Amino acid sequence: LPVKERPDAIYTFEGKTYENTSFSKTGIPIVGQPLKMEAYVHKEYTHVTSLEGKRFKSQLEEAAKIYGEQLHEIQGDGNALTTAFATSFLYLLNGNATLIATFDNILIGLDAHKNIPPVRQTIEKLKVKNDLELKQILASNETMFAFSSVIRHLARQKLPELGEPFSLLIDEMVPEEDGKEIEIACIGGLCQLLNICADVIYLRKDYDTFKIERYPNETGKPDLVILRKAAHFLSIILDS
Amino acid sequence: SLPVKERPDAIYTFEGKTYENTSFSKTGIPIVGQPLKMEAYVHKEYTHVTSLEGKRFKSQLEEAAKIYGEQLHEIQGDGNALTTAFATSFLYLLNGNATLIATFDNILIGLDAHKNIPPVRQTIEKLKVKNDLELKQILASNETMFAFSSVIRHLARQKLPELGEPFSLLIDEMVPEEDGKEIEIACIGGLCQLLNICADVIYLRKDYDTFKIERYPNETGKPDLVILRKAAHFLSIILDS
Amino acid sequence: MQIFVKTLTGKTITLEVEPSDTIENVKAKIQDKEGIPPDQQRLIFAGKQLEDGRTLSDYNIQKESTLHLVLRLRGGMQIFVKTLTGKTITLEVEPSDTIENVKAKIQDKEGIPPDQQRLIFAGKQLEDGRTLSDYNIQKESTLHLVLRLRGG
Amino acid sequence: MQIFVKTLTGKTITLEVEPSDTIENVKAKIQDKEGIPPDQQRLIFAGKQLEDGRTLSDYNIQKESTLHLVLRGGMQIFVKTLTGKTITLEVEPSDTIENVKAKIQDKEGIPPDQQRLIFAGKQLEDGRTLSDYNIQKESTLHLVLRLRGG
């Protein structure tokens, strides 16, 4: 891509110097620290005036009312869908030896991938419930990027086996290349394979209320709660 | 004129069934309705509201009542609603106001001949002493209020050009002579200037969450009239003190 | 302008509209006041059907004009759209309706923009510019809806 | 996609946008988050100015891209309402009357098709330019609202 467009690039415009930034320079983590929704709304919508922003603001506050007061921000590196899923999935794996074993068995069957070994080493550390280890896992940009890329690879290899629509749309729905956005149907397929339930919160700018996409059945108790804010995904910390 | 099937009260057939256009005379809608609480009006117009345009109109109507008054007068949409709503709000101000009745009567004497001028003068003469019951009878008379409305149109066309621009330049486009032709909002501003009164016009906006208040003749001042613009239609708010 | 609308039950309603308002916008006003969903509304004026894309001025509709809600045409095809989760959506369409028009009807019932919808029939993704007849989609046929809503 | 915006003060902010969002919509999101009015915003990316009509995809803006707010010779004119309210606009001699009515809308919330503009006792047509009417610096136009009804 052209020099003037690249992150960290420096150029001149009308006698003044400008320096593009990047995720590495801003220090934005792959998965942010636990953050109350009211703080997130104040961060993103402190001067809200537009109709789209007022709707997003009220829908975000309603989502917290229903699912939980805290969330994890997710870096928009193009893998936010699988990074938000991995974040919510890790909360479910914490202290769940049966689910960790089922997940580890799936990883063994996947084609080779550089990030599979480290992910297996990670889930081993959560067989006994350990909130502190989960916190360290989610705070490691390298660990969560590995987790995120493994979910993408996993979806591409296993979802086509579920039949249509995945057999027909896998490449359009879940691209292989890192940094390429993923379609929401990927979450539905993953829930079907892993036999878990997820609520995806579709924030709608054309309506006053959001839309809940629940997988795999329109009824059921969600184990994961993922929020779609425009072409971006965040992870809600589910309260019990 | 206009095709038969389009005319009010016309009966025609469509796909094996008969249909009957209605009309203002058949529906019995008065020129000026009876006093009506805003919440009752909102329940009539927006009981199943779902669209963004309707929810904005609904919330702007409720804010208007909070600021100006709980009741309003519905106005028949015969094309004269601007002058009919003005006459309605103006009559509340004329009630018991001998000084304003004389100022209005003096303008009427100078206007070109018109059959509805004599009845309007006889009507306002009956309001020199405050009489809410007579006002109620006046506003309930379709014949009286149509006469009042047409006299305001005639008055605006004859006197507003005397104020200078923009009225001298746009009078025919702003206030058509023919009865039933819609009138532009600037006509209210001119009338307020001539009659030395103040009016708040509530412009309900479908593209914004709040309405916009057009105050005449000065952007400051206490309103004597409160007129509501609901799309290409005008209603009269009953001003509370 | 103030117009009249007569429902299938004969009840008469008034609407405050403007000449530039579209027929789709009128149906939206009819729903706000009376509750009839726009997808059930078929409006006529002076014995002529009204299309959702035109405006009142085009049909020289003015003050005191009366629009009539009428029964829909017999013989129209009912189809079904099933989501990834198994939810069944029921639509009324004609063989000439494009796939885009079908996605617009889906939007009116589900609140999902057309550009965020994929439609599949016979294991094949459907193109926006082609008609239902072009795909030999018949009465009571079932299409499949897959949402896009991509993000990263 | 998640993009970056650097303000005139050097502050860096993130925005959750979509490829189809228009530049006008971007400025609205910048206001919602940072408070800068859109009329003060001049956005550049890779040394090219962004007009309110394009979208991010047209300027091949993607994730991690950085937009910079920069400082902006416009002609000052005045629009006086029927009541005497004075509106101040920045215009060019080539701007059409429709463009001026669009600027009035952004400051008053009145649609262009509901506005009449008068200069030198003459009504102004939407398709003609300010230069066609000899509208110069500090000229005063008159706004008369339509908003007809019946």
Residue numbers in the entry:
A (entry chain C): 3 to 242
B (entry chain A): 2 to 242
C (entry chain D): 1 to 152
D (entry chain B): 1 to 72, 75 to 152
Question: How is this structure described in the published paper?
Answer:
Some intracellular bacteria have evolved deubiquitinase (DUB) effector proteins, which interfere with the host ubiquitin system and help the pathogen to evade xenophagy and lysosomal degradation. Here, we report that the opportunistic pathogen Simkania negevensis, which is unrelated to Legionella but has a similar lifestyle, encodes a similarly large number of DUBs, including M1- and K6-specific enzymes. S. negevensis has one member of the OTU family (SnOTU), which is more similar to eukaryotic otubain proteins than to other OTU subfamilies. When testing the same protein (0.5 µM) on a panel of di-ubiquitin chains of different linkage types, complete cleavage of the M1-linked chains was observed after 10 min, while none of the other chain types showed any cleavage after 60 min.
To elucidate the structural basis for M1-specificity of SnOTU, we determined the structure of the catalytically inactivated (C82A) fragment SnOTU1–255 in complex with linear di-ubiquitin at a resolution of 2.5 Å. The asymmetric unit contained an unexpected arrangement: Two OTU domains were bridged by two di-ubiquitin molecules, that is, each OTU domain was bound to the second moiety of one di-ubiquitin at its S1 (distal) recognition site, and to the first moiety of another di-ubiquitin at its S1’ (proximal) site. Overall, the arrangement resembles the immediate post-cleavage situation, with the two halves of the product still bound to the enzyme. The OTU domain of SnOTU1–255 is fully resolved from residues 2 to 242 and comprises the OTU-typical papain-fold domain and an additional N-terminal β-hairpin motif consisting of strands β1 and β2. In agreement with the OTU alignment, the active site is formed by Cys-82 and His-234. Indeed, the proximal ubiquitin is bound by an extensive surface with major contributions from the N-terminal β1/β2-hairpin motif; deletion of this region leads to complete inactivity. Tyr-13 and Phe-15 within the β1-strand and Tyr-20 located in strand β2 make hydrophobic interactions with the Ile-44 patch of the S1’-ubiquitin (Ile-44, His-68, Val-70). Contacts outside the β1/β2-hairpin also contribute to the S1’ recognition surface: Arg-230 and Lys-231 form salt bridges with Glu-18 and Glu-16 of S1’-ubiquitin, respectively, whereas Phe-25 interacts with Phe-4 of ubiquitin. By contrast, the salt bridge between SnOTU Glu-185 and Arg-42 of the S1-ubiquitin is crucial, as E185A is the only S1-recognition mutant that completely abrogates activity. SnOTU achieves M1-specificity by a particularly extensive recognition surface for the M1-linked ubiquitin at the S1′ position.
